[PDB]
């Protein structure tokens, strides 16, 4: 694995249905699982991941579709991508597990957590895939783009033929600009259009304005449990940011059991590029808490 996971760090591969799922893991104790969302991988963590030694065996993931896991012909739906998931959790047979998830992470991990109750201690979030989200609370370029990238044929020319996801969209939404070698690490995983399938399924997936309604359904399945799990529960917020509107942060406010929110300063989406001394303290401080 890479050096800026930190020493004792090592990597192997999951097997899941034919596939490879990429893991780095680090030290030993009841597990701590980060997930990452479009269009990143396990080393969006590496920050947080290092800074969190000791707390428990440490466990990043590389989604199906995304970093050094295998990226096969299939449709990226929330609900394929949710199998990979669960074959992962399965392998490990993890029990007493506390989840840090964001973006599509957050859908997948509170999606596993709901059907897997008994298995969970407590889930830290920020900017996840959550809910609906309404248009006019989200940056009017990126809904542009998103509505360009649902038709047919311009979705796939832009992400995968021009390539222009990860060349233009994904380094604009950064407040502090990515060095130009974390910014090459993110795009190593995506060397041809076929590679690149996962990261159109993105945008297509995320629900704005009620669309699609697969996905709004989708995510209305693990609400229940935000609702009524006695799990500790922890949201991270951070000005601007992008996915967590306001409408959605009231909402986790008024519908989540036993939720704490921190804010953690300044940010857009990938704030594990913009605030990880931050993140890895207030995370320390409430696993710290919880023990």
Do not use: C, M
């Amino acid at each position: 694995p890479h050096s800026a996971f930190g020493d004792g760090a090592k990597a192997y591969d999951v097997p899941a249905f034919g596939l490879q799922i990429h893991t780095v893991e680090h030290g030993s104790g009841a597990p701590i699982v980060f997930l990452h969302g479009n269009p990143t991988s396990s080393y969006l963590w590496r920050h947080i991941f290092r800074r969190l030694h000791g707390h428990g065996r440490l466990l990043a993931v590389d989604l199906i579709g995304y970093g050094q896991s295998s990226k096969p012909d299939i449709e990226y739906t929330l609900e394929n991508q949710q199998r990979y998931v669960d074959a992962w959790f399965d392998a490990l047979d993890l029990r007493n597990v506390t989840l840090v998830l964001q973006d599509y992470g957050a859908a997948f991990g509170l999606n596993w957590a709901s059907r897997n109750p008994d298995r969970v201690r407590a889930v830290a979030f920020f900017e996840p895939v959550l809910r609906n989200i309404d248009s006019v609370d989200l940056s009017p370029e990126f809904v542009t783009r998103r509505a360009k990238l649902r038709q047919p044929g311009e979705g796939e020319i832009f992400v995968q033929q021009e390539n222009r996801f990860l060349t233009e969209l994904f380094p604009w939404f950064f407040l502090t600009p990515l060095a130009p070698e974390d910014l090459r690490q993110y795009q190593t995983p995506f060397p041809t259009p076929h590679s690149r399938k996962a990261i159109l399924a993105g945008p297509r997936n995320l629900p704005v304005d009620g669309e699609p309604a697969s996905t709004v359904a989708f995510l209305e399945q693990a609400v229940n449990w935000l609702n009524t799990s006695d799990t500790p529960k922890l949201l991270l917020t951070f000005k601007p940011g992008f996915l967590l509107t306001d409408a959605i942060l009231k909402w986790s406010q008024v519908t989540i059991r036993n939720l704490e929110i921190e804010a953690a300063g300044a940010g857009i989406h990938f704030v594990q590029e913009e605030q990880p001394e931050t993140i890895a303290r207030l995370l320390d401080a409430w696993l710290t808490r919880i023990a």
